[PDB]
Design an enzyme around this catalytic site. Structure first.
Site, PDB file in Angstrom:
ATOM      1  CB  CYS A  23     -73.719 -18.420  30.701  1.00 50.14           C
ATOM      2  SG  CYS A  23     -73.992 -16.682  30.299  1.00 50.14           S
ATOM      3  CB  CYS A 281     -61.071 -11.627  25.926  1.00 48.77           C
ATOM      4  SG  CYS A 281     -62.624 -10.832  25.418  1.00 48.77           S
ATOM      5  CB  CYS A 323     -61.570 -12.176  29.871  1.00 46.96           C
ATOM      6  SG  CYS A 323     -62.775 -13.353  30.564  1.00 46.96           S
ATOM      7  CB  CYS A 330     -69.034 -10.682  29.978  1.00 44.60           C
ATOM      8  SG  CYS A 330     -68.716 -12.118  28.930  1.00 44.60           S
TER       9      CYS A 330
HETATM   10  S1  SF4 Z   1     -64.419 -11.158  28.788  1.00 41.97           S
HETATM   11 FE1  SF4 Z   1     -66.488 -12.052  28.398  1.00 41.97          FE
HETATM   12  S2  SF4 Z   1     -66.688 -12.001  26.094  1.00 41.97           S
HETATM   13 FE2  SF4 Z   1     -64.457 -11.743  26.548  1.00 41.97          FE
HETATM   14  S3  SF4 Z   1     -63.604 -13.885  26.489  1.00 41.97           S
HETATM   15 FE3  SF4 Z   1     -64.143 -13.453  28.691  1.00 41.97          FE
HETATM   16  S4  SF4 Z   1     -66.264 -14.292  28.911  1.00 41.97           S
HETATM   17 FE4  SF4 Z   1     -65.873 -14.085  26.637  1.00 41.97          FE
END
Ligand code: SF4
Ligand code: SF4
Lengths: 371, 367
Positions: A23, A281, A323, A330
């Protein structure tokens, strides 16, 4: 077939579609530490790490590749072993040292600030010398030290891309260069390997396969497996979202590699487009927009009337930039994007949404600016 | 198994679980017009309707029951025929008149304001007399004219807010026969809304929940003369809390005994969430009832698993925006169907509360 536009698109494609080991929370810390070039990591008298809250509130649960550990501490230790020339793949080829983690645990101090992306590293050694790093705003924007890595896409080349239409991307997926065909094939292969078991499976149907395979790839990346992921615009999650539902949909359908290649490229093109037109997100709003268009091309071809319907339906059924649930929430967000994108291919919208694809991308971009 | 708990819960169940004919967008306009009591609708020299934008952007695509027409114009015409004593169900038993729609189309003027819920009606007739209506904030808060207001009490509501999931699990074991018939009615009423395929993409359990929930939702939106068992005056909230559990049962054991318990538990959780919050909101509160209800059918009274389902659903919370065009609301329920079903297969570590009560308060905070 402007030829000049072909030259523009291909440069954007090689600049945004890149590999990443782990990541970008841990990848960023590792790369920022690696830029200090500490010849003997055991000489460090003290180390200060300055991170923004947007990258701190998630790094604790992310696994660091080649360490078997999770969090900030092994990301810094890994950075002290990796090469700054590896950039986002800094953790590649590192031989982890527990003796170094024990020594660094004592001298590591973390300061957290409430600002956009920021990753500063300050080091003071036994000899009295000091070292400094700074990556700010973009995952590869190295402020300190001065590194004349001149090619990164400038603002004019970016503005030229924002002004393009879906018709240009539909023409480009016919006139594909062999380097771009190998880049797309690499993307399909790289992210396909990330599927390592069942994370969220609830059947054999097309949708449940897209959900399971997208979430498995997402989980494999987050746990810290030594497997690179083909990221789109520096986001590994956004590259997964843009590709895995189309790879899994192809597997559950024609299994046509020629079609898979065109759809995956179209998806990636749409994703970069949305990212460029967006503000601070987005993984599922921008990545899922590429996925819904890519899936619509595989299922309907170059039917603009149906591609525009898919964008309006997806924009109406927008998942939610929440998010907030660290990582694993995620994967749940990617699973929700999988549902929104797949379901949008079966509903046609007759207000809050735009009229065409370009209008919908600007509506999504507007939501991320004010909210 | 306190006896005082059975008293408050049952009184709230009968107050919140009620029938509803048509969406409360059109239902509100009809009820506000009906309060003017125009003895001869053909005497109206002019009519002004003052609506807030939060209810105007919906009503154009919403069908009015017993009219075969869609929009504000037939909702006002319907209001001129219906009885103010019918309240939200003003469209029941109305005999639509095209001659009245032609006459009213000319004299109807609509003013749109940017404020919370507001529905004012001003009428001036051929004789020179004037009439006025006003419903603001709540779907049943009649400001003009002054009414008795009847039983929904502040002490009773606060007593229900302080209850825990353990009380609802105990209540689904000692259910009164009136409440069993109310739950059976709810299951039947909302099952009848299923009228075809809206969003079907297979035969699997999830695709059935999605298709049946959206078909039921669509039926209500198009103004079919079919009541829906609403929860806390929301027809959509009532669909969300029930249809996924009715469709899950159909695709699973087909056990009416468990279906009733799960549907009741879901409704109890929905009212609870609704009470805990002020000011999209159908899928967050109605979907929370659905996820708990589905978790009871699949796992029983396992609190450790019911708490996991709530944290996972709260983490995978759907979109915050209320989807426009009315068509977007079917899509929002479909998304809630996905979030609720998927939450039964994932467990969350560590935003996101620890238990069911903490998660309901987190959702309530977001709204
Ligand atoms: S929830 Fe996960 S996939 Fe969505 S913007 Fe945040 S880190 Fe990225
Ligand atoms: S979008 Fe959500 S809150 Fe708005 S009417 Fe539909 S279900 Fe209710």
């Amino acid at each position: 077939m402007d030829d000049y536009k072909r030259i523009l698109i291909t440069k954007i494609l090689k600049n945004e579609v890149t590999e990443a080991l782990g990541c970008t929370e841990v990848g960023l810390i590792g790369y920022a530490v690696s830029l200090c070039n500490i010849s003997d990591p055991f000489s460090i008298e003290k180390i200060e790490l300055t991170l923004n809250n947007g990258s701190f509130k998630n790094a604790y649960a992310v696994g660091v590749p080649n360490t078997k550990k999770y969090g900030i501490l092994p990301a810094v230790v890994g950075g002290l072993l990796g090469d700054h020339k590896n950039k986002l793949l800094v953790f590649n080829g590192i031989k982890y040292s527990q003796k170094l983690e024990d020594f660094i645990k004592e001298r590591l101090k973390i300061r957290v600030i409430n600002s956009p992306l920021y990753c500063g590293v300050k080091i003071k050694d036994n000899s009295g010398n000091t070292f400094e790093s700074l990556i700010k705003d973009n995952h590869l924007n190295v402020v300190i030290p001065k590194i004349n890595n001149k090619s990164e896409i400038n603002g004019s080349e970016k503005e030229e891309y924002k002004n393009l239409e879906l018709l240009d991307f539909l023409e480009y997926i016919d006139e594909i260069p062999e380097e771009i065909i190998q880049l797309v094939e690499k993307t399909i292969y790289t992210n396909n390997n990330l599927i390592k078991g069942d994370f969220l499976n609830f059947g054999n149907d097309c949708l449940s396969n897209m959900v399971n395979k997208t979430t498995s790839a997402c989980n494999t990346r987050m746990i810290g497996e030594n497997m690179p992921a083909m990221s789109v615009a520096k986001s590994g999650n956004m590259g997964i979202m843009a590709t895995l539902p189309i790879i899994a949909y192809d597997y559950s359908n024609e299994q046509n590699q020629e079609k898979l290649i065109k759809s995956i490229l179209l998806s990636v093109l749409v994703t970069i487009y949305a990212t460029y037109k967006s503000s601070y997100c987005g993984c599922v709003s921008k990545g899922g927009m590429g996925a819904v268009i890519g899936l619509c091309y595989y299922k309907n071809g170059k039917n603009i009337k149906k591609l525009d319907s898919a964008a309006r339906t997806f924009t109406a059924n927008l998942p939610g930039i929440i998010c907030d649930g660290g990582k694993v929430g995620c994967a749940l967000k990617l699973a929700s994007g999988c549902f929104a994108a797949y379901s949008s291919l079966f509903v046609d919208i007759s207000g809050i949404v735009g009229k065409n694809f370009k209008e919908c991308v600007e509506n999504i971009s507007e939501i991320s600016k004010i909210m």
